[PDB]
Design a protein around this ligand. Structure first.
Ligand SMILES: [Cl-]
Ligand SMILES: [Cl-]
Ligand SMILES: [Cl-]
Ligand SMILES: [Cl-]
Ligand SMILES: [Cl-]
Ligand SMILES: [Cl-]
Ligand SMILES: [Cl-]
Ligand code: NA
Length: 129
């Protein structure tokens, strides 16, 4: 599924991400824009052989099982395929564990490089939330 901007803002609010760990909804929408362009089916292979999955590009190195990332963990206790669903519940539940892990949203390098410190409220501007 390719979400629209306000459609994703609304889904992320419905699943309790807005202000989760103090990160306003615009931060989460911005992170999803630059990680996946709002596409739930996005996958990207890392140099180290791990893969990133879904709207928030969650990595098989730590968070999900894909069966092809040696020495990896599955800390969200999910198949990485669950992160590619039209329903964002698994991505949101896993993202909540990631952002709790101690470095906040810096875990998402695209958030650090493209969203952190910017006018992230622009991402939810005009949305009926
Ligand atoms: Cl957009
Ligand atoms: Cl915001
Ligand atoms: Cl594996
Ligand atoms: Cl594990
Ligand atoms: Cl699995
Ligand atoms: Cl959803
Ligand atoms: Cl933080
Ligand atoms: Na894994």
């Amino acid at each position: 599924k390719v979400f629209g901007r306000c459609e994703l803002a609304a889904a992320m609010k419905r699943h309790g991400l807005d202000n989760y760990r103090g990160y306003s909804l615009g931060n989460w929408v911005c992170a999803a824009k630059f990680e996946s362009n709002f596409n739930t089916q996005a996958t990207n292979r890392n140099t180290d052989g791990s893969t990133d999955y879904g709207i928030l590009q969650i990595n098989s190195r730590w968070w999900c099982n894909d069966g092809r990332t040696p020495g990896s963990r599955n800390l969200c206790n999910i198949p990485c395929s669950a992160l590619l669903s039209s329903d964002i519940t698994a991505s949101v539940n896993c993202a909540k564990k990631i952002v709790s892990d101690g470095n906040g949203m810096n875990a998402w390098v695209a958030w650090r490089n493209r969203c952190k410190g910017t006018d992230v409220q622009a991402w939810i501007r005009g949305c009926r939330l």
